[PDB]
Design a binder for this molecule. Sequence first.
Ligand SMILES: COCCN1C(=O)c2cc(-c3nc(Nc4ccnn4C)ncc3C)[nH]c2C[C@@H]1C
Length: 343
Amino acid sequence: PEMVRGQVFDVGPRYTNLSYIGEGAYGMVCSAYDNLNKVRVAIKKISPFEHQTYCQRTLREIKILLRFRHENIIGINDIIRAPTIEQMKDVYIVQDLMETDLYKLLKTQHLSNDHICYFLYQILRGLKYIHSANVLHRDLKPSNLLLNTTCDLKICDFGLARVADPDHDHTGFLTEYVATRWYRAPEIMLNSKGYTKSIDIWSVGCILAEMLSNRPIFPGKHYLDQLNHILGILGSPSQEDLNCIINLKARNYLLSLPHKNKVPWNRLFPNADSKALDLLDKMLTFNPHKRIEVEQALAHPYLEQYYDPSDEPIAEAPFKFELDDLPKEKLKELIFEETARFQ
Ligand SMILES: COCCN1C(=O)c2cc(-c3nc(Nc4ccnn4C)ncc3C)[nH]c2C[C@@H]1C
């Protein structure tokens, strides 16, 4: 029973030689040697039972990832848990090991246009598939984008992922949000729950901008500051953009701000490709209805060397549609049942 960074992993004895990769609010990720397959693997310990919200996410993550099979999305190779509900303390997810993630790469390495183009291609290919299943990732960021020696890109961390619910998206001004701040679409701050596909497109734009400069484009130090970084670049939203925001608190806040002009993409990224900046402009659109969809982003002249509709698969069976009320105990039961097949 090895330990890492204060947590105990009950992966014995099939997986050994552990090391630590990442941490989460209710989960930890570590590398391990798998004897059966004779290769290095990623193991995700998830402790969601104490809290209810964590149980919902965990069930959603396991169900989504078991559903998916895509070259650009992390899969589940195995699920380790205790044989009984009473003995089930933690849930262990075995996934393929990736060399690193885009966050780590960006901290130390300059990316060439070729790498940028190809990374964006694989993100959009993976996202096209996620979206075709009627799934929103909701937490796209460089640390959720894994890479290997040959530059293959895989999307991971589906804990915050939900089935799309456009009808129930509207909400009040300054409504709290879980997902990473720097990659939040401006609507989240003003009138959205993050229940539409356009939410992920905005995150992809932020990543593209971070690939062009090795620095986050909108590094807001707090909830409101995030919005003011966005408007600082995008300029004051148009009359037509403001008209789509009907809740008055959000509208009156935008109207009270002094007029700021749109900073040009070329001035922010002078070394960037002109086609790359044209796509970035489309992704980073203040109005979510005017924002480019994943399939149009793939069809963009910046990705014409990789664009192939036939080689961009979509989900065979999309998710159709209530864990919000279900307590930690009933959720522990569904998690146990969803992980049964791996015993
Ligand atoms: C606790 O959960 C929080 C969310 N979260 C993940 O689920 C997860 C999974 C991986 C992961 N990471 C690598 N390798 C890699 C990334 C960075 N350095 N190295 C060696 N290989 C495979 C996987 C599946 N990375 C992450 C990022 C965070 C930690």
